[PDB]
Amino acid sequence: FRVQPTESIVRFPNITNLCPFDEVFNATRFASVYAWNRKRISNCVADYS
Amino acid sequence: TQSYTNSFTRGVYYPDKVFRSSVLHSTQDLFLPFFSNVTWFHAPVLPFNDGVYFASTEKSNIIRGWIFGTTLDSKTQSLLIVNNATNVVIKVCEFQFCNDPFLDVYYHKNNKSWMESEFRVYSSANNCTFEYVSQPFLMNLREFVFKNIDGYFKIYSKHTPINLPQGFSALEPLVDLPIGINITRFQTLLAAYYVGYLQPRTFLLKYNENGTITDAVDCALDPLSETKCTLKSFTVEKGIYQTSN
Amino acid sequence: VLSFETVCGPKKSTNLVKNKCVNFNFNGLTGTGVLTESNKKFLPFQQFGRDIADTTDAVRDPQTLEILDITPCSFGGVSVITPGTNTSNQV
Numbered sequence: 001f002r003v004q005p006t007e008s009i010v011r012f013p014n015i016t017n018l019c020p021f022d023e024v025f026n027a028t029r030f031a032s033v034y035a036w037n038r039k040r041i042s043n044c045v046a047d048y049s
Numbered sequence: 050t051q052s053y054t055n056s057f058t059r060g061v062y063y064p065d066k067v068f069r070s071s072v073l074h075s076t077q078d079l080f081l082p083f084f085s086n087v088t089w090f091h092a093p094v095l096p097f098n099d100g101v102y103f104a105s106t107e108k109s110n111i112i113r114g115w116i117f118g119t120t121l122d123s124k125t126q127s128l129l130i131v132n133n134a135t136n137v138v139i140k141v142c143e144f145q146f147c148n149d150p151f152l153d154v155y156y157h158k159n160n161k162s163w164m165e166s167e168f169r170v171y172s173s174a175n176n177c178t179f180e181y182v183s184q185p186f187l188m189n190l191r192e193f194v195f196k197n198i199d200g201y202f203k204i205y206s207k208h209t210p211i212n213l214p215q216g217f218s219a220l221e222p223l224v225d226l227p228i229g230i231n232i233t234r235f236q237t238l239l240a241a242y243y244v245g246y247l248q249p250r251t252f253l254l255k256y257n258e259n260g261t262i263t264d265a266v267d268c269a270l271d272p273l274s275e276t277k278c279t280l281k282s283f284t285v286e287k288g289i290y291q292t293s294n
Numbered sequence: 295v296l297s298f299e300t301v302c303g304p305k306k307s308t309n310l311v312k313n314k315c316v317n318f319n320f321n322g323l324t325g326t327g328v329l330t331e332s333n334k335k336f337l338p339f340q341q342f343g344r345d346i347a348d349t350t351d352a353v354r355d356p357q358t359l360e361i362l363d364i365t366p367c368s369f370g371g372v373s374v375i376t377p378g379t380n381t382s383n384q385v
């Protein structure tokens with residue numbers, strides 16, 4: 001005899017330190033192609049959606 | 050100055066994040082050997098082999114900061130740790146030139162005890178990756194153990210008031226910063242140093258009911274300790290016991 | 295252009311259920327068991343718990359500051375008590 005599971009749950013810590021993808025995309029003024037900006041996005045949760 | 054002193058059961062830290070109550074656990078990790086000899090440093094680059102144990106005591110805040118790296122040149126990335134009065138900055142950024150550490154001609158505290166806004170040791174701040182800011186590391190005796198295992202740099206700390214004194218004090222984890230750099234040398238900075246080096250030993254920690262380490266035994270010091278580790282107990286009864294080969 | 299080469303996508307969560315045999319996943323600590331509150335006191339930095347037989351006993355959920363035990367939901371064998379089949383048929 002064995003009691004089968006009734007549900008499956010997954011717990012992870014709060015989401016915070018979301019990457020600055022918001023800042024990159026909504027720049028008021030971009031630069032010309034010859035001098036293109038670059039941002040090393042590191043150590044953050046991406047959330048590409 | 051390299052005067053030597055023995056470490057009386059100092060340099061014990063929590064190996065894992067798990068919790069154990071009223072049970073003896075045997076673990077095989079890097080540790081400072083019991084009754085090993087340490088080196089006092091006074092007013093040189095250390096070899097930093099397989100971890101380090103840092104300890105210092107003073108009534109002032111003269112001691113602050115550390116620098117780590119394998120070459121201290123532009124070829125390889127270098128690491129910095131510096132504590133402010135109210136914050137700490139930990140940026141792994143390359144540093145090229147170091148003409149001389151700052152040192153006032155007088156450096157007399159009998160008349161003037163103000164030394165502020167005089168920190169410039171990095172000649173060039175080249176491209177780098179990581180930067181962490183948190184609560185001050187320092188606040189009594191301060192004990193720190195620095196490790197670099199599997200790309201993770203781990204820092205442990207503990208504040209033990211004194212009257213390396215005898216006793217047992219467990220080092221709790223503080224900040225596991227993920228630099229990823231290779232570290233082969235380290236050096237301390239100024240505004241009484243205890244330096245010890247770890248070896249791949251095996252220990253037998255004793256966990257309290259609340260979950261804190263109270264006692265530990267090194268399984269490679271004397272045959273009695275080997276017998277204790279084999280029996281997994283701190284009290285051995287009368288008899289003959291086989292320990293090793 | 296987002297070139298690719300610590301940076302990992304957000305992992306969503308699920309509501310906490312107690313007193314039922316539920317599959318759980320606490321920061322990659324997969325297992326099965328019942329979830330009940332515990333009168334233990336972990337250290338501030340500890341997250342898991344482990345008994346003498348190296349089996350997860352208590353786990354702290356990453357979101358709220360609470361610690362709960364992990365007990366396997368009931369299992370075991372079954373037996374049938376019957377007289378002689380000629381004597382009767384009830385079991």
Ligand SMILES: *[C@@H]1O[C@H](CO)[C@@H](O)[C@H](O)[C@H]1NC(C)=O
Binds near residue numbers: 053
């Ligand atoms: C180890 O420490 C002792 C002091 O207890 C000292 O005499 C000895 O020289 C040290 N070992 C080495 C290799 O210097």
Ligand SMILES: *[C@@H]1O[C@H](CO)[C@@H](O)[C@H](O)[C@H]1NC(C)=O
Binds near residue numbers: 133136138168
């Ligand atoms: C901490 O000290 C560094 C050293 O230059 C300084 O750049 C930084 O601004 C200080 N932190 C704060 C919060 O002022």
Ligand SMILES: *[C@@H]1O[C@H](CO)[C@@H](O)[C@H](O)[C@H]1NC(C)=O
Binds near residue numbers: 175
């Ligand atoms: C950072 O600077 C070093 C020093 O020249 C260089 O070799 C490296 O390509 C630069 N970029 C990265 C991502 O390390």
Ligand SMILES: *[C@@H]1O[C@H](CO)[C@@H](O)[C@H](O)[C@H]1NC(C)=O
Binds near residue numbers: 229230231
């Ligand atoms: C560190 O050392 C390892 C092997 O000793 C080597 O593969 C690696 O390239 C070195 N540098 C870094 C940044 O890991």
Ligand SMILES: *[C@@H]1O[C@H](CO)[C@@H](O)[C@H](O)[C@H]1NC(C)=O
Binds near residue numbers: 257258259
């Ligand atoms: C465990 O913690 C409780 C609550 O702080 C305390 O009363 C008890 O003395 C502790 N046990 C020790 C220190 O062995």
Ligand SMILES: *[C@@H]1O[C@H](CO)[C@@H](O)[C@H](O)[C@H]1NC(C)=O
Binds near residue numbers: 014356357358359
């Ligand atoms: C996550 O968010 C909840 C919202 O109620 C909060 O209670 C909890 O403290 C947060 N996580 C942390 C930092 O414990």
Ligand SMILES: *[C@@H]1O[C@H](CO)[C@@H](O)[C@H](O)[C@H]1NC(C)=O
Binds near residue numbers: 380381
């Ligand atoms: C059950 O009991 C009856 C009466 O005692 C007997 O006749 C019969 O043979 C028994 N059944 C078997 C399988 O022996």
